[PDB]
């Protein structure tokens, strides 16, 4: 057995988590669920968007499955995902982009890639930002370290080995930003030598984005620095229809958090209309992470086959089914 | 009349410049040509990849049309385009992306946008780059100024007015990189108030790249900082088939240089196979810049119509025509 922390969340969160846990049970993933509060429900009932008991649950179990959360506006609330990243040193932001039939387009299918984005350093740090008093000159910084580069590239290669993928492409601008991006590329080359059967490719970031729109089928795993990974993961979402079906993970040494990328959609909450596919695919990522890749693949192919058959699809996809009915149609093809 | 500096260049350069000048004469653009050397031919014949007489020609005429150049490898030669940018303070890197029929795909057409990239500051500066002696820590910097932001955004809006376009989208990451990207966005908003009939849009860079792959038709002029503009212009090239047909300009206060983005292709030099469309479209940009937008549009629609009719196309496009024959077919539809 293994226990995971489950955050049911806000809006459509509870409905799609119910559906996801149904499919996980139908897979016989062997998991048990421990529930924790975050977001609106925590704020109302425990005084904090992110209570220490939930942090302790995640610390103990090291794996969390997280529905979307609502954070109120206008009250100075801090980003929950940022707080978790700082708390658990979640250095790998991992975003799969995969083609599915009948899910809107840029069609032609065949996209099946993962963007591994370094998420603790690079160009997105708070440190180094200042504007002069007269408002004329702004500066910002970037920091790349051997330690931070080594761990993100090792993660990418370990992911390749753990899921049966065959190529890692390191994306950089080392010709121009020689110090930081050059150190990232030097480290990536060094790490690649430790994984002889995984093809290693280097590609400049501008050419990478051109190639992603001309032939995204050529990519397998992409690994890159913080800002570049932000950009590339959202580009790739556009290749496969957008953010409505997108899973995500944020992974560190002693904790990993799996989710849907989309928000809590409170307008349709409780109506059984929400599409559970994104969170299901986040649970597939979780299964890959905890060592059940065969079940992750069973789940992804069942989703493909259910979409091909148009069996009990939710209204966002032109069907008249409901969240749980869609989940049950998926589970029937496992 | 007006005189422009013409650089015939290396490889296919002379052939495609001959064809371009033929079309410009057929347009009766009213130009006269002054020839200057750069690249291999200059190195052989005047001792320098970039002679001072060529710089003086550009200084005097303020407008240059430049074929591709070859720079030898292994001899420490400096980038010619970088030298020109520093010499003339060429702060606007301007890249049109337009759909043409029968030119390879990501098909469905309807793309017609321009990326205006700030090219003197931002995250691509040499200053601020250092690696610690032990190799563990690398740093790089970015600088954004009110002056530099004001001039690039003013250029974008002036371009809109000068060519009949209707929207400028400023692209940023001011939510995270608050100092530099935030100053860029603050300045862009301020400048936009001076152009009431040009729609102003703000968009975060990751969402922009997603939207460019889902519906590139929504964009008109995009203006952004140095690194972001590098990325977006190559993404956009991938929407319209790649770099083989791509024009470019680099523009400052007292000089402007217009070209094809592609290289000198020495393998097919002299054979009459080279496609002159990219340099022709660079000449269209030049015509927009010097105040003949009606002739730039005549040229672009003649290219569209020639491609639609499949009249004398070069082999890269599946025809059996030659460079000058393709140019003459274009000129017949002016």
Nearest Cβ partner for A210 among B178, B179, B234: B234
**Sheet containing A112-118, strands listed edge to edge, beginning at the edge strand earlier in sequence:** A31-36, A2-7, A63-66, A256-260, A247-251, A92-98, A112-118, A221-224, A167-172, A199-204
A88 CA to chain B: closest CA distance, Å? 20
> Cβ A142–B142 below 8 Å, yes or no?
yes
How many domains are contained in chain A?
A: 1
Nearest Cβ partner for B238 among A182, A211, A243: A211
A2 CA to chain B: closest CA distance, Å? 36
Calpha distance B236→A68 (Å, rounded)? 33
Which two structure tokens, joined as six digits, stand for B238? 């991938």
Identify whether A206 is a catalytic site residue.
Answer: yes
A156 and A94 Cβ atoms separated by less than 8 Å: no
B148 CA to chain A: closest CA distance, Å? 10
Calpha distance A199→A188 (Å, rounded)? 12
Q: Testing the interface with A: which of B106, B140, B244 to mutate, by most A Cβ within 10 A?
A: B140
Nearest to A300 by CA among A287, A281, A321, A317: A281
> Cβ A142–B145 below 8 Å, yes or no?
no
Max intra-chain CA distance, chain A:
65
DSSP 3-state assignment of A25? helix
Calpha distance A259→A64 (Å, rounded)? 9
> Which residue among the candidates A87, A109, A124, A195 is catalytic per the annotation?
A124
> Cβ B142–A139 below 8 Å, yes or no?
yes
A220 and A161 Cβ atoms separated by less than 8 Å: no
Q: Find the residue in B nearest to A184 (Cα).
A: B138
Q: Find the residue in A nearest to B177 (Cα).
A: A124
A83 CA to chain B: closest CA distance, Å? 15
Q: How many CB pairs under 8 A join A and B?
A: 154
Beta-strand pair B167-172/B199-204 = parallel
Going by the DSSP 8-state scheme, the letter that residue B268 receives in this structure is G
A-chain residues near B230 (CB < 8 A):
173, 205-206
Resolution in A: 1.6
Is the dihedral angle over the CA atoms B29, B35, B36, B39 positive or is it negative? positive
Compute the CA torsion angle B84, B90, B92, B95 (nearest 10 deg): -20
Nearest Cβ partner for A179 among B138, B144, B234: B138
Name the one residue in this structure whose structure tokens are 């212009």.
Answer: B233
A-chain residues near B183 (CB < 8 A):
131, 135, 138
Torsion region of B104: left, alpha or beta (phi above 0 gives left; psi -120 to 50 gives alpha) = left
B51 CA to chain A: closest CA distance, Å? 25
B-chain residues near A238 (CB < 8 A):
209-214
Helical H runs in chain A?
Answer: 13-27, 40-46, 52-61, 80-88, 146-163, 180-192, 205-214, 226-239, 277-290, 293-309, 323-331
> Cβ A206–B233 below 8 Å, yes or no?
yes
A-chain residues near B128 (CB < 8 A):
141
Calpha distance A27→A298 (Å, rounded)? 8
**Residue B206: CA atoms inside 13 Å, Cβ hemisphere, count?**
17
A132 CA to chain B: closest CA distance, Å? 10
Q: CA of B15: how far to CAs of A55, B81, B246, B302, B329, in Å?
A: 68, 21, 17, 20, 16
A-chain residues near B234 (CB < 8 A):
206-207, 209-210
> Cβ A146–B135 below 8 Å, yes or no?
yes
Contacts within 8 Å (CB) and 24+ apart, B186-195: B187/B146, B187/B149, B187/B150, B187/B153, B188/B149, B188/B153, B188/B223, B190/B150, B191/B150, B191/B153, B191/B154, B191/B157, B192/B153, B192/B157, B192/B168, B194/B157, B195/B157, B195/B160, B195/B161, B195/B168
Q: Find the residue in B nearest to A216 (Cα).
A: B238
> Cβ A234–B137 below 8 Å, yes or no?
no
B-chain residues near A142 (CB < 8 A):
123, 139-142
Calpha distance A140→A131 (Å, rounded)? 9
Q: CA of A127: how far to CAs of A52, A123, B139, in Å?
A: 27, 10, 12
Q: Testing the interface with B: which of A133, A143, A231 to mutate, by most B Cβ within 10 A?
A: A231
A153 and A223 Cβ atoms separated by less than 8 Å: yes
A-chain residues near B129 (CB < 8 A):
177-180
Domain that holds residue B39: 1-334
A278 and A259 Cβ atoms separated by less than 8 Å: no
Q: Find the residue in A nearest to B134 (Cα).
A: A146
Torsion region of A310: left, alpha or beta (phi above 0 gives left; psi -120 to 50 gives alpha) = left
> Cβ B180–A135 below 8 Å, yes or no?
no
Chain-centre distance of CA B194, in angstroms? 26
Contacts within 8 Å (CB) and 24+ apart, B39-47: B39/B7, B39/B9, B39/B10, B39/B13, B39/B69, B39/B70, B39/B71, B39/B80, B39/B264, B40/B10, B40/B69, B40/B70, B40/B71, B40/B72, B41/B8, B41/B9, B41/B10, B43/B72
Beta-strand pair B137-145/A137-145 = antiparallel
């Amino acid at each position: 057995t293994q226990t995971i922390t489950v955050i049911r969340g806000d809006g459509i969160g509870p409905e799609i988590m119910d559906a996801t846990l149904f499919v996980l049970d139908a897979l016989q993933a062997g998991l048990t669920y421990e529930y924790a509060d975050a977001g609106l429900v925590a704020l109302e009932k425990h005084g904090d968007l992110l209570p220490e008991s939930t942090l302790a649950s995640i610390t103990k179990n090291k794996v969390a499955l997280k529905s979307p959360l609502t954070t109120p506006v206008g009250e100075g609330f801090s980003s929950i995902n940022v707080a978790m990243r700082r708390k658990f040193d979640l250095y790998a932001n991992v975003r799969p982009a995969k083609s599915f039939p009948n899910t809107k387009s840029r069609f032609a299918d065949g996209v099946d890639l993962i963007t591994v984005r370094e998420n603790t350093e690079g160009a997105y740090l708070s440190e180094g930002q200042e504007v002069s008093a007269d408002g004329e000159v702004a500066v910002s910084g970037a920091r790349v370290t051997r330690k931070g580069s080594e761990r993100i590239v090792r993660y990418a290669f370990d992911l390749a080995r753990a899921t049966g993928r065959k190529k890692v492409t390191a994306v950089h601008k080392a010709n121009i930003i020689k110090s930081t991006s050059g150190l990232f590329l030097k480290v990536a080359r060094d790490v690649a030598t430790q994984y002889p059967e995984i093809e290693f490719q280097e590609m400049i970031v501008d050419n990478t984005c051109m190639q992603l729109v001309m032939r995204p089928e050529q990519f397998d795993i992409i690994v890159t620095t913080n800002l570049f990974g932000d950009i590339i993961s959202d580009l790739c979402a556009g290749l496969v229809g957008g953010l409505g079906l997108a899973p995500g993970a944020n992974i560190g040494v002693d904790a990993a958090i799996f989710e849907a990328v989309h928000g809590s959609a409170p307008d349709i909450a409780g109506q059984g209309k929400a599409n559970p596919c994104a969170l299901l695919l986040g649970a597939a990522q979780m299964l890959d992470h905890i060592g059940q890749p065969q079940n992750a693949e069973r789940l992804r192919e069942a989703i493909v086959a259910t979409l091909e058959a148009k069996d009990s699809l939710t209204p966002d996809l032109g069907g008249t089914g409901n969240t749980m009915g869609f989940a049950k149609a998926i589970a029937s093809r496992l």
